[PDB]
Design a protein around this ligand. Structure first.
Ligand SMILES: CO/N=C(\C(=O)N[C@@H]1C(=O)N2C(C(=O)O)=C(COC(N)=O)CS[C@H]12)c1ccco1
Length: 159
């Protein structure tokens, strides 16, 4: 793919907010959100986070991610990882994760990137593993139906 990236803009909101296809996908990428997803919920996330970035191919916004934790000189934690349904498995997430790693190193002087992935998200767990992330801990969380899920906390040194 001929991918580029830039900071997320207002005009991208409607597109990105269309990416989660069901409650599970929304929970996996934004567990505080309530289905149905909306532009206002995405904009609120952006306002309270850092680094919101889109990946673009052939004029189309295909990916989005941000940081929900950032500690200068230490680490960032990547979240809100969303990819357009027509572009899944084509390398958009891996591209964007690489972009966000550079942004963490360069702008936050981070030595580590943290990613948390829910247990049900096999594709996520396998991709982050391919990208050199290692599992560090498992935490209990609850899904929207009040059922227990396992949040797998992974990390990777930067550089
Ligand atoms: C306050 O912490 N509560 C969390 C909690 O760990 N949220 C954290 C938070 O924000 N994350 C995000 C996020 O919103 O970007 C994700 C999404 O990750 C990816 N890979 O896209 C995983 S979870 C973590 C939680 C989860 C369920 C109930 O509570």
């Amino acid at each position: 793919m001929q991918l580029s990236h830039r900071p997320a803009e207002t005009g991208d909101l409607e597109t990105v907010a269309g990416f989660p296809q069901d409650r599970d996908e929304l929970f996996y990428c934004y567990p505080k959100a309530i289905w149905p997803f909306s532009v206002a919920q995405l904009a609120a996330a952006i306002a309270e986070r850092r680094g919101s970035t889109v990946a673009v191919h052939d004029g189309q916004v295909l990916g989005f991610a941000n940081f929900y934790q950032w500690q200068h000189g230490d680490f960032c934690a990547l979240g809100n990882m969303m990819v357009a349904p027509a572009a899944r498995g084509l390398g958009v997430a891996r591209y964007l994760i690489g972009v966000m790693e550079n942004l963490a190193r360069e702008q936050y002087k981070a030595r580590l990137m943290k990613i948390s992935c829910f247990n049900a998200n096999a594709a996520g767990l396998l991709l982050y593993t391919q990208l050199g992330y290692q599992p560090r801990a498992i935490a209990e969380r609850h899904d929207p139906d009040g059922r227990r899920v396992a949040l797998i906390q992974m990390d990777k040194p930067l550089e």
